[PDB]
Every structure is written in structure tokens, then in C-alpha cells.
Amino acid sequence: MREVISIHVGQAGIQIGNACWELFCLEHGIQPDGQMPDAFNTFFSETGAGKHVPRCVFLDLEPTVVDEVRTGTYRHLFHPEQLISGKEDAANNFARGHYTIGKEIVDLSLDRIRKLADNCTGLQGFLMFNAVGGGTGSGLGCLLLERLSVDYGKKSKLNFCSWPSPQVSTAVVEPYNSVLSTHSLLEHTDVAVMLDNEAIYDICRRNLDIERPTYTNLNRLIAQVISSLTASLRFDGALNVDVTEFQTNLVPYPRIHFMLSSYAPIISAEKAYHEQLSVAEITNSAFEPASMMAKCDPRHGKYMACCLMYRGDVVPKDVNAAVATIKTKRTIQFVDWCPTGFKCGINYQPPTVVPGGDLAKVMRAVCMISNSTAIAEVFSRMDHKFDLMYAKRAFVHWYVGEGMEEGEFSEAREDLAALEKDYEEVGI
Amino acid sequence: MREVISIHVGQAGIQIGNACWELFCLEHGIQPDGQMPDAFNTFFSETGAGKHVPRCVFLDLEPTVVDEVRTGTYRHLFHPEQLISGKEDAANNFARGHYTIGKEIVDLSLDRIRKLADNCTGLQGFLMFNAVGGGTGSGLGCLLLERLSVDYGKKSKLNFCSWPSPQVSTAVVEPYNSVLSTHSLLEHTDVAVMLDNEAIYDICRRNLDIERPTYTNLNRLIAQVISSLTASLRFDGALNVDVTEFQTNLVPYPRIHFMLSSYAPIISAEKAYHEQLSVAEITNSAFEPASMMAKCDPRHGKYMACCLMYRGDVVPKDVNAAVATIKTKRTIQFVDWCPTGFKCGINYQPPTVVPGGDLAKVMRAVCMISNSTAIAEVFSRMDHKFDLMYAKRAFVHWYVGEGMEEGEFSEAREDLAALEKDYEEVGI
Amino acid sequence: FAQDATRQRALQGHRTADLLKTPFDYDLFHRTRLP
Amino acid sequence: PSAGASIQAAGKEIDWSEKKLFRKAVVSTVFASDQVAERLRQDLP
Amino acid sequence: MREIVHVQGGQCGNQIGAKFWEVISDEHGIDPTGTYCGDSDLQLERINVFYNEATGGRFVPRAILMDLEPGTMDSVRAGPFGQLFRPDNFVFGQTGAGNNWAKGHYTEGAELIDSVLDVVRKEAEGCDCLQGFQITHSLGGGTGSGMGTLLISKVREEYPDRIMETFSVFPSPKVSDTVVEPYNATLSVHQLVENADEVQVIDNEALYDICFRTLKLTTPTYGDLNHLVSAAMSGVTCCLRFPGQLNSDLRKLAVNLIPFPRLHFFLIGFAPLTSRGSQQYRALSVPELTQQMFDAKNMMCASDPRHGRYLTASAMFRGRMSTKEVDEQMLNVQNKNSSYFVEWIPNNMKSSVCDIPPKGLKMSVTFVGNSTAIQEMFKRVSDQFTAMFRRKAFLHWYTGEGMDEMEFTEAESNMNDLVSEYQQYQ
Amino acid sequence: LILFPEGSLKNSNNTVIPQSHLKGKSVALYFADGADPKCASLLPFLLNYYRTMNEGGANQKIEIIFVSLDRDREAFESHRAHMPWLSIDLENPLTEILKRHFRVMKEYEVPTYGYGSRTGVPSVIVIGSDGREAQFLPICSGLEEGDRALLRWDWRNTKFA
Numbered sequence A, B: 001m002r003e004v005i006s007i008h009v010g011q012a013g014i015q016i017g018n019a020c021w022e023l024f025c026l027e028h029g030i031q032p033d034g035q036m037p038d039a040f041n042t043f044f045s046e047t048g049a050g051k052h053v054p055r056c057v058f059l060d061l062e063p064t065v066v067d068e069v070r071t072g073t074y075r076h077l078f079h080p081e082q083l084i085s086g087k088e089d090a091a092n093n094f095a096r097g098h099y100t101i102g103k104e105i106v107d108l109s110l111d112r113i114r115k116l117a118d119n120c121t122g123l124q125g126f127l128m129f130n131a132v133g134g135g136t137g138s139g140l141g142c143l144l145l146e147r148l149s150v151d152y153g154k155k156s157k158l159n160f161c162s163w164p165s166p167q168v169s170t171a172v173v174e175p176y177n178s179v180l181s182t183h184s185l186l187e188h189t190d191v192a193v194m195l196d197n198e199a200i201y202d203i204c205r206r207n208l209d210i211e212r213p214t215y216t217n218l219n220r221l222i223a224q225v226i227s228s229l230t231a232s233l234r235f236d237g238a239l240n241v242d243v244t245e246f247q248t249n250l251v252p253y254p255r256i257h258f259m260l261s262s263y264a265p266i267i268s269a270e271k272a273y274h275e276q277l278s279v280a281e282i283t284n285s286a287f288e289p290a291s292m293m294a295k296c297d298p299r300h301g302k303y304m305a306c307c308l309m310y311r312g313d314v315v316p317k318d319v320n321a322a323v324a325t326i327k328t329k330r331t332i333q334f335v336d337w338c339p340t341g342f343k344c345g346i347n348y349q350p351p352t353v354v355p356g357g358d359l360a361k362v363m364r365a366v367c368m369i370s371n372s373t374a375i376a377e378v379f380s381r382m383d384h385k386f387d388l389m390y391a392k393r394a395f396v397h398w399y400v401g402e403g404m405e406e407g408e409f410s411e412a413r414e415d416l417a418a419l420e421k422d423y424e425e426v427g428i
Numbered sequence C: 001f002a003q004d005a006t007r008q009r010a011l012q013g014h015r016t017a018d019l020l021k022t023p024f025d026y027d028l029f030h031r032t033r034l035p
Numbered sequence D: 001p002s003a004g005a006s007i008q009a010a011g012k013e014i015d016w017s018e019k020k021l022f023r024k025a026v027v028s029t030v031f032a033s034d035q036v037a038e039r040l041r042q043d044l045p
Numbered sequence E: 001m002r003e004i005v006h007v008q009g010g011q012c013g014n015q016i017g018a019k020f021w022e023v024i025s026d027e028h029g030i031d032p033t034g035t036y037c038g039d040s041d042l043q044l045e046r047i048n049v050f051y052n053e054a055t056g057g058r059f060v061p062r063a064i065l066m067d068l069e070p071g072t073m074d075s076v077r078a079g080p081f082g083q084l085f086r087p088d089n090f091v092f093g094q095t096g097a098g099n100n101w102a103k104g105h106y107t108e109g110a111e112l113i114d115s116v117l118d119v120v121r122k123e124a125e126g127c128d129c130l131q132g133f134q135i136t137h138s139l140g141g142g143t144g145s146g147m148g149t150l151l152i153s154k155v156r157e158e159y160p161d162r163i164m165e166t167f168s169v170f171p172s173p174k175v176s177d178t179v180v181e182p183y184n185a186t187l188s189v190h191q192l193v194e195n196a197d198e199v200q201v202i203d204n205e206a207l208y209d210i211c212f213r214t215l216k217l218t219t220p221t222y223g224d225l226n227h228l229v230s231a232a233m234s235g236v237t238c239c240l241r242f243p244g245q246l247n248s249d250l251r252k253l254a255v256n257l258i259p260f261p262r263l264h265f266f267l268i269g270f271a272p273l274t275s276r277g278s279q280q281y282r283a284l285s286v287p288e289l290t291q292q293m294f295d296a297k298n299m300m301c302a303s304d305p306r307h308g309r310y311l312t313a314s315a316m317f318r319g320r321m322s323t324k325e326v327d328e329q330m331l332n333v334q335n336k337n338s339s340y341f342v343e344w345i346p347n348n349m350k351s352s353v354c355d356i357p358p359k360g361l362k363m364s365v366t367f368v369g370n371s372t373a374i375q376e377m378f379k380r381v382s383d384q385f386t387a388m389f390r391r392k393a394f395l396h397w398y399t400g401e402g403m404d405e406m407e408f409t410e411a412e413s414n415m416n417d418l419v420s421e422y423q424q425y426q
Numbered sequence F: 001l002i003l004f005p006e007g008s009l010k011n012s013n014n015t016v017i018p019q020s021h022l023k024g025k026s027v028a029l030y031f032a033d034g035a036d037p038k039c040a041s042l043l044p045f046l047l048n049y050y051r052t053m054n055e056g057g058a059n060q061k062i063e064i065i066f067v068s069l070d071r072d073r074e075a076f077e078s079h080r081a082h083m084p085w086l087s088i089d090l091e092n093p094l095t096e097i098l099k100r101h102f103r104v105m106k107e108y109e110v111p112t113y114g115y116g117s118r119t120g121v122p123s124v125i126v127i128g129s130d131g132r133e134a135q136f137l138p139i140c141s142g143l144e145e146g147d148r149a150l151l152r153w154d155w156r157n158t159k160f161a
């Protein structure tokens, strides 16, 4: 009937979904052994009597984190065959993750894909969870998408890429990985959700006011923003939005599908005692530059199209009032080629929380999803980052020694340059 | 509906505002946390399950006056990041607080102003609070008035400035700060009234028979002035008076928008024993020059407009009888172009005492605010005090070092002498 | 799911069923024909 | 996962009732006629 | 013989007719199990018009429900009065229409239209003949306006002379969900004009305005709005189900409203409407009710009637009232609003009386007025569409799925033609 | 179940209270040592936290039960005098029951039992009705947010119900 297959590659992908599938089983009330003490069928298959098996696949080339999930808490709900261990890491190389050592894992992973999709009809989408900076996150991350566009060419490959910060990148050959995988990710994905490390670091400092986050605290927020995206899939709402609809109302040209997200409220228990979580203010609190997931200022950008879906007991009347409030605002200057720019998704399910995490509860959670012309700056800093390192061909002998010949570095320059100019010619 | 946002800058406005909200919380019957066991809507907002929060922001550039409140008894009253604090004190510098250190906090100070303004439509305006004695109240205070004026155009900005006492001002660089803090305060605030400290001091000797109280005992008297000023809009009355009425009935010309204040009776548990407190005699005790709380003596000046707010079991015929004897009173001289010069307002409740304070249970009270020609003398002596500083450039290197050049002081001299000439021509 | 009575009656439109009804002495049908 | 027993934060209930055009206002002595009401009508000593 | 077969297209139609079958069930005295109740012989003597006998004394509605998503039609089955419909009347979709007029109409909708025309023709031909159809749908949604308009197009050549009477939810101007509005609204009107006999215009934000000001509520849900419009939608067809002094069926409403065969968009109103605090001090009489009719605060469409010269009008009262109190006041509207009713058509307005009122009412009415004032509605759909079209985006899917340039320009020129005769007959 | 016996709770003014006394109050256990330098830096902040939030309160909101890590009767009473709230006597069986129950001991591990972690001094464990850890206030943890983690107390959803 209704199902979605989630794919995770890289260490960022495995631990992001380690928080996503924790939050999913927390929603349905199932004990994380697989036993429950019809709406869960989009994320879980039924195997026997009361046993729930996830629709996830775990992929990397380095086995120190797939075996950590295997020996970890979720040993029995996660059946031991969904996880795949590699031989050796791609080691921050697109060429290693795609050409040399990726061939021994892509054959097993695709044999999993068509034997997990042939179980029932009505396959709906894929949730690809990849890190663009990582070598196996972009290497095996790339290699899975053209092979997924060959067999399932008439389906949706939705993506979640953690773009690097301008200052925080935690790798030296990281901008080499980003430039050379985005062009090959471009015409093989159809929806791209770009997040950032330092952006959510700023969020955790400001409104959830921890001085001290870590990667798992990153993973609570991203698991929440994916769950709000999939809220109308699993459960019931007034205006339900499905996977085939996120692209219906955001991507005007096939080239422009890169896109930001945010979430509101992101608060603590002491931060919910004292203020409105009203509909008229959450939309305002999700539109400032201090709230999105990419630290990309849209004040010199131009908003283009946005889904604003809700979850909880919320009525579309004060939703409609909040929409007119945004349109009458002068600072959020929308484009002139569409006076209409909104979708208001809505769902009745109360916002779930993890007991233990600092994200306190509320009866209204709002994920802002937005396509904008502000992407020109976040890719332009990415372009001059490459041009300074490519001045005297730095770090290129690793890639050409792996078998990736000198010369397909170079069209990745003007392909991202052609993408960069696309933002100017749509905003004129 | 009816809304007002009390904004405070400088630490003088911090524990003046602390006495303001301890009087407002006690008057409305709400708890130090906020749970009480539409009427409260103008100062508190309904935020929680029977729980309310103040509509105020506390803006100071140094921590020891803000964080000690955040660790005090009212820590669950305020939304905890409405109490925004800087890193380093401006230290009696307009130049630092307006040009080089103000921008580090005013970007987030405005950011919280338009949460509170967006929460409801129908603001009358903002209750501005500052003292022009110091550097944060002058510098960061003045910068706040240009940006509030350009963002919000036709909203009332009703400022309570603690004007320095004439003969002493517990500072040395004081004549430099205020004469150019009132430079831009002329064209950015709307309804401003002088509050001299030493006038609150010597009414405490004569009326309350109290000889060694502290700043907070002044703040009890100031907070009663706050409550009586806006209880006509808060609670129902025979002749209700709004904030847009205070523009109407006070200011003759847009430049001359400075007034005075008086609050009578101010009696202890000795004088409330033996005195009757009818309206016909407390109005005489409110118009007397000794009860003036700015040390501006009206005897050598001409009254232009006068407003009165009454709280208690007042009958309007006693308002008419009291103002009739004032018109026949020959030393209280009213200007020849204003034959009718009175606004009156009626409220039903008596003033609420702070337990353990220096006020007594009084049935009826008066809050008087008057625009008078005589108030040019507190700027005439201030003009003379700045002249013997600026004669051979005292303390000029402190202010030229962080943002202004030599010439803004004389440019502040020009419109303050223009103020003196405007006051002289209207008092003819 | 917020299954409380006031919310579920609100989604079920019972409020308009209450206040489009006329709350007075309404049903007037007498047979004027006499034998 | 059994730590779900919790009263929900951010306490608004969505006002399903009629909006309050008229809040309870204390009508008292000055907006209370009497006096001349029985002086224009002489209700007898 | 006088049969109406209901069609509820998409998530719009299923829930807007869920409230209609709710308010017509208890008006006809029917419990949610299906069998008959309701202590009045009026409602049984004409019960076939919306119901069929299920050989057990049980009445089942004559409704066929469109959708490509089983989510919201599972919810109406769980809800009350949802088990009334026989299970063979529903049709299941699995792919899901993506609020795309191309997706609903052409490519995967053709695999369900063969599976739903075979059930609507069995429902229609079970009687000797039928008076017409009613179809409920939106124009901002693709599962409601893809199968909605295509079912209209093929029933035209199937049954060439029986009426189609569609209640259309239009894109609201100020608020805008489902941002591809004009590619659906403009590309559905351009076949509604030549293949539908009656179209009734309902706006979402106008329903918002009339319940927040006039009906005076703070924040009800969407389900309270559906009860407002389905009450008037029941009052339109009161003559087909109940007797009256002045009989007027749906084709009687047809001939008396449409002067020229191509413009058939109508305004729909309901009266009386008032709040809980405003029930007991108000008058209930035909004088005040006909005055409550004729204002923007009653209109369910957000087109200002004062900007439009009324072409024709109609009012079907319900209850027991005198005819002269109807028509002297109905004339009194004409001579008081001298400039507001078009001069070359004398006596622009017509009345009709149902002898029964709706339950809990005494004198109710529905106002079907073919006013010309929908220049503003049709011209800003076309202003939004011409901002959408001079640039070629949100349209490369339509070209890739199988259209070309000429059919968008056909719909834009046709919708420019919708505006064109409105002012030059005004 | 009955977590504490009849004569175990022990407050100021030297009197015992039973277990039903904690009905409707946020209940927390204070694993702390008298001479520990963490506890010297943290106890004044718990004293102010206990001060303002329930004194400015409508009902009793907070109880803290000191459970001691000390070494002497005289050292126990000396730390007792500087502290008003509830507590547990050191040499009852109760201290070493909630010690292994809540994983709060002081590197004396192998000479007693062969388990792993210790999560020792200092700690406050706000708890539920059935002896369950309700949420951790991170003074010395992976967060190591000492002297400030008291603001992370979730007092509305943790009741001894």
C-alpha cells in the first residue's frame, strides 16, 4: 500500500537516521525490540506476529559505526541484515567512494533495493540521507543515485544533504568533495534539503540555549524536521501533503530544487512557561535569519515558494491570518513572478518529543520549508573556496592515483557556475 | 486589544521597572510566578494555563543589574530572554553606548521588541524608561529612539526620563551626556516628563517624615505614578483617558513636549490618622510648588496645560469644585492663549499599597502632569553647567575616541539654545 | 489526537447546527378549514 | 518510552467559544442613577 | 423520474458532501444505520430523489465518491453517516493526484474513469430517467478538479440533454494554499463553460468572512463551514423533495437564470444567519430577511455585489409564509436598488416557495443570483495566470506529461473571453 | 510500591515524615559529599533555587532529599546544619539501596561489586513515583553544565504522583 524506503550513507547519515528511527518508533508506541505493548505501515513492515521491521538500509564503507548500531540498544527491532559493513573507508575521497571500493558494496545494496520494493505495490519515495563533505557520503552517496535513477527512473529520490559551514568544515579536502559531487547529484535527485552544522549550532545556542551541543543534539533537531515532513504520510490530518507533493509546489524549473528548512518552536522547558506558541507568531519566529538551517541570510535573497505545514490541534483560520501577516511584511520581499507563494499543510497529531532531549513539548510544531534565490551566496562562497585551492592543483594526486583522470575536475567548475547563474536569471 | 509595552534601558529603569511590575502584579492579584488565584491584557499577556507574563524588555549593557534579577525571586515571572544584558558597561559614555557598543545588543533588542508588538494589534504605544544620568540610559537609550521611530511611525512613545538633579547629580561627566541625549530626544519621543531625584528626596522629608530611605523607596513613589497614569485605560472609569489622550491634553506645540509631575497625597501611618483627604484639599496639595517632583517652581512661570488622574471614591462634582478654586487661586497663573487648561480622569479603585512600604491606605489620590513655561530653568542652569566644561574641553577625549568628532557638542548647543528661545517666545 | 468533547464537536460542525436553529416558539400549523 | 505522562506545555486551548465583546464591568455609584430617580417620582417619605 | 445522482470529487467533494448527506439525512429523518425515522410523512413520500431502497427497508444514498487517496475517504467511513453509502459506490486510488490539473485529468486518471463511469451509469439507468446530477468539487485541488471536470466532460456526451449542476470551490484571493492555483482554476473553467449547465461559485475566504462577522464566531473548524454551505445547498433542491405553493425544480432555476447559454456562474446565499447572542432579539419575517439577503456580508463569494449590475436573481424560501409578503418586498428590493438591477430585463428576480422549512427553521431561503459581479473573480484569476504564463515555469511538467503551448493559450484566451461579455452586457 | 520505610525521611526541626507527604511535590535526590569541592561550589546555588521558586509560589513545589556520601556522624551533622530541606540518614540501609539503584557511587567500585560506570559526586536525580529516574540535571556529565543545569529542571511533568 503506502511505503517509503529510507537510505543512509556515511557516518552523518547513519546517526541522523539513528535519531529518526528512534523518533518514529516513539511515535507509534512500539517498544524498540520490535513488539508493540495500520498507520505505521509507511515506515515499518509487519513480519509475523507483532514484530515490526524498519524500512531502512544502512550503508558505509567503514564498519566501526554500522557495528555500533548492531551491538547497540536497537539490536532486535533493527533486524541484523538491514545493516551493511564495508571493508575500508573511502577516506575523504569521492574517487574512492565511487570508483575503486564502492563497486563491492553497490551490488549488495541494489540487490536489497529491488527486493525491499517488490514486497508490496505503491512505493512512494526514497529518503536519501547523505553527507556531501564525507568521502563515502559523497562517493557511495553519489554512486547509489544514478543507479537508482536507472531502475526507478519514474519515482522520487528526496535527499538530505548536510552542507558545510563557511568556517566549520572539519576536513581539508572537504571543498573538493562538495564541488565534485553536487553536479552528479544535480540531475539524479529531484528534491534536495540542505542543512548546515554551524546554523543548528547557532540555533542550539540561541533559542534552546544550551551552551554545549554535540552531534546527537544536532540529530534531535534533524530527526524532528524530517518527522514533521512525514507527519501527513503516516498519520491523518486535514490537508495531508505527501511525498509526490513537496516538489509540486517548490520546484519551478528542473534545475532549481535545492532548498532550506527550519523548525519552530525550538525551546526548553523553562522556555515554554512564558510565551505564546500562537499561530500568528510561530511563522514569524521561523522566518528570521536566526532560525533557518543553513545560516543563509535571505534579507538580500528573495523568497520564491514555501510549504508551511503544521502538526497538532491547529485550525486553518489563524493560519490564514498569519499568511496575510507575512505577505504584508516588507522585509520578506517575495518575488514578482508569483504573487502566491504559500502552501499551508496541516495535521492533527501532537508534536512528539524524546524524553531526555532538551526540546520541550508544545501542541504546535511548524517546519518551514522554503525555496529561495539566496542559494546564490551559499554556493558562491563554495565556488571561490574551490578556486583558491585549485590554483596549483592541490590535493589532486590522491584522486588521479585512484583512477579518476584529470579533466572531470574541470567541468564541475562550470557546471556549478552554470547553476550559480541560474539563481540570477530566475530572480530578474 | 489595549496594549502597552514598557521598555527600560539603563539600570535606573531596571529597578524603577522592578517596582513597576511588583506594583502591577500586586494590583492585578497575580503571583510572583504569575498564576493568579482581558482586564490584565494591557500589561500582562495570557501565556500558559492560568499563567501570565509581563510585556516588558530589560535592556542594560552590563550584567550585574540584570542577572541578579534573573537569579532573584521574579525569575519565573519574566520570559527569561526578555531580560537581555550586554557584556561591558558603557561607563557614562554616550559615545560608546551609541556608536561602538550599542550595535552589539540593539540588533537583538529590536528583535524582541517585535515579538511583543506582533502579539496583538492595537498598541497605544511604548512606556519608555531611562535616566539620562549615565551612559547606557543616554547612549543606548537614544539610539533606541531613532530605530523605534523609523520602524513604528505613528505609535506613542511616552518617556519617563530621570532628569539629573540641578545642584548635585552624583556624577562629573553628567553635563556632557544629557545635553546631547536630549538632542535626538526632541524629535523622537512624544510624551516625555522630567523626574528630578532631589525633588523626590525633599518631598520624602516634608510629607513622609522619612530621612534615610534608599532608591527603591523612590521607586515605590515612581511606580504609583505609573499605575495611576494608566489605570484609566486598565480599569473602567467615569472619564477614561487613553495614551492618545495624553498627547491631546498636555502638549501645545510639538517641540515643547516636556512636562512635570506630582502625586498627592503622599502620607504615612501618622498623617493618614489625623487628616481628612477630600478632593477639595488634595488638589491644593498637588498644585503646590513644594510637592513638585522636578524642582521646577511654577511661581515664576505660566501654566499652559494640566492633566489630572484620580483614583478612588471620587465624585466628579468634587473634581469640578476643586478645579474651580484652582482657577480663582491667583498665584497659579495660566497663560493668556489657554483660557481653559484642564484634563481630568476618573478611576474607581483606590491605590494599592506595597506591604511594608512607606505609603498608607488612602481612599483617593491625584496624579498630575503639567506642561509649564517654567521648566525652561532646568535647561537654563544645565546650559550654564555645560559651558564651563566646554570652555577648555574637559573630558572631550573620551567621547571623540569612539565615534563623534568635535562639533556634535556645539550642534547640541544649537538646538538647546533653540529650545530656550522657543520656550521664551511661547512664554510671552 | 485531542479527542475531547469540545474539539470533536467543533470538527463535527455542531456549533452551526446549534445557532442556525431558531430558539423560540416556532411550529405554527393550525387547520383553518371548518366542517 | 513510558515517560509520556506529562501535562502539555505552551498552554493555549484554541478558543472555541464566543468571543468576549462584553467583559464584566463594575457599574457603580457615578454610573448609578438613584437619587433624582425618586425625586422626579416622589416615592414618599 | 426526478432523480439527482450525487458525485463528490476529490477531498473537497467527499467532505463537502459528507456534511450535505448529514444535513439531508436528519432532514429526511434517517438514522446512521440507514433505516427510516423522523415522524413526518412529507419526507418519505419523496425519498427516492436522493436514496435507493436496499431490499431491507434501508435507504442508501445515491452518491459516488471520487479520490485517488484512500486517506480522507477512510475517515468519512469511520465518521458518522459514512456507512450509509454502499461499499461498491466508492472507487479506490493508489497513485494519488498531486494537486496538478495534468495529473488528475490525463495520465493516471484514465485508469479510474473506466472504473467509475460504469458505476455512475448503473446508478443513473436504474430509474426510468433522471432530472440531473449534482457534482461537488474544488478548483485549487487536482484530485477534485482533475476527475471533477473530466467526469463533467464525458457525462456531456453520455447524457446529452440532462443537466449538470456543479458547486465549485474557487481559489480564495488573499490566502492561498497549494500554490499552483491558476494552472488549475484557469484550466478547469475553460471546459466547465461549455460542458456544465449550472455552476455555483463558493469562495473559501468569503465563507470565512460571513462566519466571523455576520454569523459571529471566533474560530470554528472547517466542519462548521461545510454545515453553512450544505444548508443552502439543501435549500436549493427543496422543491424536488418536498411540496410547495410555487413549485420550481432545478431546470426551473435554469431557464429563469441563464439568459445566454454560455455564462452560468451563480451566487449562492443563505438566510437567516445570526449568532447565539444575536438570536433572541432579532425579528424573523420576510421584510427583514430579504434585506438580509442583499449585501456582501451574506454572499458566500468574495466578489463585491455593489460593483456588479445584477442580471437575474432567484430566492427559494422554505416554510409557511404569505406570497404577498414575498413579492411586494421582492419588488421593494428592485425599486430601492434602482441602479443595481439591469434595466433591459424588467423584473430581474423570481421567487419560489417550499412549504416545509429546514429543521429548526421557520422561514429560510437560498439566493441563487446570476450577478455579473464576477468580473473581479475571473480577472484576477487571469491576472495571476498571466503572471504565471509569460515566463514558462511550473509548466515544464505539463509539457513533459503530454501537452503543448496551444492549450494553455486556449484556456487563457477563453478566460479572457469570460471577462469580456461581462462588462459589455453590464 | 513503597520506596521508603516509615522512619526514613528526615527534615529540618528533627522530625520524621512518611511517604504520602511527598504527594504532588517535585521530588529529587541530592547525591553529595560534605567535603567535596564540587558540592561547595554547587550547594549555594541549590539553596537559592530552593529559596525563590517555592517561596514565591502558590503551593509547595520542590522537595530535595539529601542523600549523603560522607564519612562520619559529626561530618554528617555539620553539613546538615547548612541545609534546610529533606534528607536520609546515612547509616540506614536506604543510602546504599538508592546508591546502586541510581548509579551514583564514588570509585569504590571493584572492592564491592563488578559493574561499570559510577556517575558520582555531585548529582541531583529528580525522580518519579515508582523510583524511576525522571530526568537528569547535568552538573557533571557529558554536558558538564555545572552551576546552571538547575534551570533545566522540568517541574511540571515530574510529580510524585
Ligand SMILES: Nc1nc2c(ncn2[C@@H]2O[C@H](COP(=O)(O)OP(=O)(O)OP(=O)(O)O)[C@@H](O)[C@H]2O)c(=O)[nH]1
Binding pocket: A009, A010, A011, A012, A013, A015, A016, A060, A062, A089, A090, A091, A092, A093, A131, A133, A134, A135, A136, A137, A138, A162, A164, A169, A170, A171, A174, A195, A196, A197, A215, A216, A218, A219
Ligand atoms: N548535520 C550533521 N552533519 C554531520 C554529522 N556528523 C558528521 N557530519 C558531517 O559529515 C562531514 C564529513 O563526513 P563524515 O560524517 O565525517 O564521514 P562520512 O560521511 O562517513 O564520510 P567519510 O569522511 O569518508 O568517512 C563533516 O563535514 C560533517 O559536517 C551529524 O551528526 N550531523
Ligand SMILES: Nc1nc2c(ncn2[C@@H]2O[C@H](COP(=O)(O)OP(=O)(O)OP(=O)(O)O)[C@@H](O)[C@H]2O)c(=O)[nH]1
Binding pocket: B009, B010, B011, B012, B013, B015, B016, B061, B062, B089, B090, B091, B092, B093, B131, B132, B133, B134, B135, B136, B137, B138, B162, B164, B169, B170, B171, B197, B215, B216, B218, B219
Ligand atoms: N529615580 C531613580 N533614579 C536612579 C535610580 N538609580 C540610579 N538613578 C539615577 O541614575 C543616574 C545615573 O544613571 P544610572 O542608572 O545610575 O547608570 P546608567 O544610566 O544605567 O548608565 P550605566 O551605569 O553606564 O549603565 C544617577 O544620577 C541616579 O540619580 C533609581 O533607582 N531611581
Ligand SMILES: Nc1nc2c(ncn2[C@@H]2O[C@H](COP(=O)(O)OP(=O)(O)O)[C@@H](O)[C@H]2O)c(=O)[nH]1
Binding pocket: A238, A239, E010, E011, E012, E013, E015, E016, E099, E138, E139, E140, E141, E142, E143, E144, E145, E169, E170, E171, E172, E176, E177, E178, E181, E204
Ligand atoms: N474542501 C477543501 N478545500 C480546501 C482544503 N484546504 C484548502 N482548500 C481550498 O481548496 C484549494 C485546495 O484544493 P483542495 O480541495 O484542498 O485539494 P484536493 O484534495 O486536491 O481537492 C485551496 O485554494 C483552498 O482555498 C480542504 O481541506 N478541503
Ligand SMILES: [Mg+2]
Binding pocket: A011, A060, A061, A062, A063, A064, A065, A066
Ligand atoms: Mg562507519
Ligand SMILES: [Mg+2]
Binding pocket: B011, B062, B089, B090, B091, B134, B136
Ligand atoms: Mg552601568
